[PDB]
């Protein structure tokens, strides 16, 4: 089989702006006078941009001989996903990952006389649990024809380099897909709205907006770095702490370049990690209002379950098929600090969290619930409590105390509700908890 | 001892503090708390033996 090409020029695809050869030749004091003394400029400019489709060139001395290819270079450009540092170990067996967090208790005043009749009293520890599971499976398929490809090279080293380049291309594609999935993680988290939303003005509207955004990020990073911790930056409303060396900021390249120049505070500390944490630059987000997201190193809960490669051969076609299988679990941790700065219009209340999201009470006991409202404005909001059990004698007070009647057999759900809309057009935010009944 | 919000506010608007970041020779060891309880208190500058 002869695949030959005819009528091909050295300018196949060229949207030329001007004739550089003509400009050099017709110059009597222009800016091109520096190239006038050059002996061979036309030859350099003719093929100085590369040749897409080559043709055989005869030797200058003896025209019967043909000039040969002297060097063959194969690009070994390798690409990686910047978030790879947030990955964790392997899980060869099993599917589900369990995360357990233990919260803090309260202080009681020393009292010898009171400590007489309550030596054996009980104080239930506060524990929370989160679950993750495998959710990504994929594979990459490639084909290599060794016998058909052996005629394109004259060196076994070049042959091995080319096949290694194909394998590296497979790996690069895998890395690209992993990065895209990791971005999808943050996009889905914001879509479900479990972030802590900080309302900002449009940074590109004016200079003051950029410096306001920078100082807001600085304040948020500091109060996240506070060693004593806070319950205002995680979806579980638990007392947690983050480190400055563990804090990472994910921002768009254009906005990062804008605020690296417009505000002089960010001109310093650009590569010191002590200003806003480890700054990671991505190619933008998918949500409309997302400008920047600042999360903890433990926020990512991604693991890999399978990473393998298999090969098969076709005796009739004389080629190898390579299948690279990647199975991963991608999830986030709700116990870690995470803040999202949004420039668009945002609701007054983002979400409502009940401290016990799961309870198991008796038929005569009581339970206490605490409501945390994630409001993007300074003004506070009022929480109303309700239950949807069904049986009479079960009721929840306005302060969050639920009492259960002595005769019922059904799961209960407790709703904490906040009204953020106006009159006769109400918008409601509801946080739910589940309660089981033990006879 | 200063509040986080005020510290971040003065880390940007004025430059003299924005130059001497992460050091001690300018304003001493800057420790950041989550605000005070007094009405008029903004910052407190004390000694180690205090």
Cβ pair A265:B18 closer than 8 A: yes
Alpha-helical (H) ranges within B1-50 are 4-10, 15-19
The token pair at A282 is 């991505």
Residue B45 C-alpha from the chain's centroid: 9
Cβ pair A215:B11 closer than 8 A: yes
B19 Cα to chain A: minimum distance (Å) = 8
B9 Cα to chain A: minimum distance (Å) = 6
| Gap between the Cα atoms of A288 and A298, Å rounded | 26
Q: Which residues of A150-184 are buried (b: 16+ CB within 10 A; e: fewer)?
A: eeeeeeeeeeeeeeeeeeeebeeebeebbbebbbe
| Gap between the Cα atoms of A336 and A295, Å rounded | 8
* CA–CA–CA angle A117, A122, A125 (5° rounding): 155
Helix (H, G, I), strand (E, B) or coil at A137: strand
Cβ pair B8:A219 closer than 8 A: yes
Cβ pair B11:A223 closer than 8 A: no
| Gap between the Cα atoms of A189 and A199, Å rounded | 17
Helix (H, G, I), strand (E, B) or coil at A300: strand
| Gap between the Cα atoms of A156 and A164, Å rounded | 12
Chain breaks in chain A (C to N over 2.5 A) after: none
Q: Looking at the DSSP assignment, which residues form a beta bridge with residue A250?
A: A280, A293
Nearest to A215 among B9, B15, B33 (CB): B9
A239 touches chain B (CB under 8 A): no
Residue A350 near residue A193, CB atoms below 8 Å:
yes
The token pair at A159 is 């042959």
Residue A237 near residue A215, CB atoms below 8 Å:
no
Give counts: helices (H), strands (E), chain A: 6, 19
**Selection from A181, A218, A224, A197 nearest residue A83 by Cα:** A181
Helix (H, G, I), strand (E, B) or coil at A212: helix
| Gap between the Cα atoms of A256 and A240, Å rounded | 28
To test the contact with chain A by mutation, choose from B3, B7, B9, B11 the residue with the greatest count of A C-beta atoms within 10 A, namely B11
Q: What is the DSSP string of A411-429?
A: -EEEEEEEE-SBTTB--EE
Resolution of the coordinates, Å: 3.0
The token pair at A351 is 């979400």
| Gap between the Cα atoms of A277 and A280, Å rounded | 9
Helix (H, G, I), strand (E, B) or coil at A216: helix
Q: What is the DSSP letter of A335?
A: T
Give A3's contacts (C-beta < 8 A, 6+ positions apart). Answer: none
Residue A247 near residue A278, CB atoms below 8 Å:
yes
Q: What is the DSSP string of A338-401?
A: EEEEE-S---SEEEEEES-SEEEEESS-EEE--EEEEESSSS----EEEE---STT-EE-TTSE
First to last CA, chain A: 84
Helix (H, G, I), strand (E, B) or coil at A208: helix
Cβ pair A211:B12 closer than 8 A: yes
**Selection from A401, A413, A423, A418 nearest residue A351 by Cα:** A418
Q: Looking at the DSSP assignment, which residues form a beta bridge with residue A303?
A: A329
A219 Cα to chain B: minimum distance (Å) = 5
Residue A373 near residue A401, CB atoms below 8 Å:
no
Cβ pair B18:A263 closer than 8 A: no
Residue A432 near residue A418, CB atoms below 8 Å:
no
Q: What is the DSSP string of A10-42?
A: TTSS---SS-HHHHHHS-SSSGGGGGSS-SS-H
Cβ pair B33:A226 closer than 8 A: yes
| Gap between the Cα atoms of A389 and A35, Å rounded | 89
| Gap between the Cα atoms of A294 and A190, Å rounded | 12
Total length of chain A: 439
Residue A436 near residue A359, CB atoms below 8 Å:
yes
| Gap between the Cα atoms of A3 and A350, Å rounded | 64
Element (DSSP H or E) covering residue A295:
strand A290-296
B41 touches chain A (CB under 8 A): no
Q: Which residues of A343-367 are buried (b: 16+ CB within 10 A; e: fewer)?
A: beebbbbbbbbbbbbebebeeeeeb
Residue A376 C-alpha from the chain's centroid: 23
The token pair at A26 is 């017709």
B22 contacts in chain A (CB < 8 Å): 272, 274
| Gap between the Cα atoms of A120 and A115, Å rounded | 10
B16 touches chain A (CB under 8 A): no
Q: How far is CA A350 from CA A50, A187, A333, A381, in A?
A: 57, 16, 19, 12
| Gap between the Cα atoms of A101 and A122, Å rounded | 20
| Gap between the Cα atoms of A201 and A235, Å rounded | 24
B42 touches chain A (CB under 8 A): no
Q: What is the DSSP string of A139-207?
A: EEEEEE-HHHHGGG-S-HHHHHHHHHHHHHHHHHHHHHHHHHHHHHHHHHHHHHT-SEEEE---TTT-H
| Gap between the Cα atoms of A396 and A390, Å rounded | 13
Q: Which residues of A233-249 are buried (b: 16+ CB within 10 A; e: fewer)?
A: bbbbbbebebeeebbbb
Report residue A348: phi and psi, to 5°: -65, -40
Q: How was this structure determined?
A: cryo-EM
Q: How far is CA A66 from CA A55, A61, A218, in A?
A: 10, 11, 67
B50 touches chain A (CB under 8 A): no
Residue A214 near residue A393, CB atoms below 8 Å:
no
* CA–CA–CA angle A220, A221, A222 (5° rounding): 90
Nearest to B8 among A215, A263, A268 (CB): A215
The token pair at A176 is 């690209």
Q: How far is CA A319 from CA A144, A315, A322, in A?
A: 6, 7, 10
Q: Which residues of B1-26 are buried (b: 16+ CB within 10 A; e: fewer)?
A: ebbbbebbeebbeeeebbeeeeeeee
A230 touches chain B (CB under 8 A): yes
């Amino acid at each position: 089989m002869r695949i030959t090409f005819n009528d091909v020029k050295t300018s196949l695809g060229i949207t030329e702006s001007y004739d550089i050869v003509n400009a050099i030749r017709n110059s009597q004091g222009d800016n091109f006078k520096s190239y006038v003394p050059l002996a061979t400029a036309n030859n350099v400019a003719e093929v100085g941009a590369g040749i897409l489709i080559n043709q055989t060139v005869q030797n200058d001395f003896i025209t019967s001989l043909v000039d040969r290819i002297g060097l063959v270079v194969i690009r070994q450009v390798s690409l990686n996903n910047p978030l790879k540092k947030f990955k964790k170990g392997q899980i060869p067996l099993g599917r589900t990952i369990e995360e357990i967090y233990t919260d803090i208790t309260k202080e009681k005043q020393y009292d010898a006389e009171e400590a007489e009749q309550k030596v054996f009293e009980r104080e239930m520890p506060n524990v929370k649990t989160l679950f993750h599971e495998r959710n990504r499976q994929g594979f990459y398929h490639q084909t290599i024809q060794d016998d058909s490809l052996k005629t394109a090279f004259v060196s076994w080293g070049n042959f091995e380099s080319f096949v290694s380049s194909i394998i590296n291309a497979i790996y690069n594609s895998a890395e690209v897909d992993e990065y895209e999935y990791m971005k999808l993680l943050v996009d889905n988290y914001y879509s479900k709205g479990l972030f802590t939303t900080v309302k900002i003005d449009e940074p590109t509207s004016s200079t003051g907006a950029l410096t306001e955004f920078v100082k807001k990020m600085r304040a948020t990073a500091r109060k996240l770095t506070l060693p004593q911790g806070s319950r205002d930056w995680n979806s579980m409303a638990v007392r947690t702490r983050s480190y400055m060396e563990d804090l990472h900021l994910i921002i768009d390249a254009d906005l990062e370049a804008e605020l690296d120049v417009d505000v002089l505070a960010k001109a310093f500390n650009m590569n010191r990690t002590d200003f806003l944490g480890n700054v990671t630059v991505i190619d933008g987000f998918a949500s409309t209002g997302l400008e920047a997201v600042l999360v903890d190193k433990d926020w990512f809960m991604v693991y890999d379950n399978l990473h393998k490669m298999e090969t098969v051969r076709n005796p009739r076609g004389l080629y190898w098929n390579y299948y690279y299988h990647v199975w991963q679990t991608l999830s986030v941790s709700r116990f870690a600090n995470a803040v999202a700065f949004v420039s668009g219009d945002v609701p007054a209340v983002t979400q409502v969290i009940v401290s016990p999201n799961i309870a198991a009470v008796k038929q005569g006991g009581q339970q206490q619930f605490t409501a945390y409202v994630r409001a993007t404005n300074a003004k506070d909001h009022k929480v109303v409590w309700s239950v949807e059990g069904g049986s009479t004698g079960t009721a929840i007070t306005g302060d969050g105390l639920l009492s259960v009647s002595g005769n019922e057999d059904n799961q209960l759900t407790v709703k904490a509700t906040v009204d953020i809309g106006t009159e006769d057009k109400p918008k409601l935010v509801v946080g739910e908890a589940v309660v089981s009944i033990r006879p």
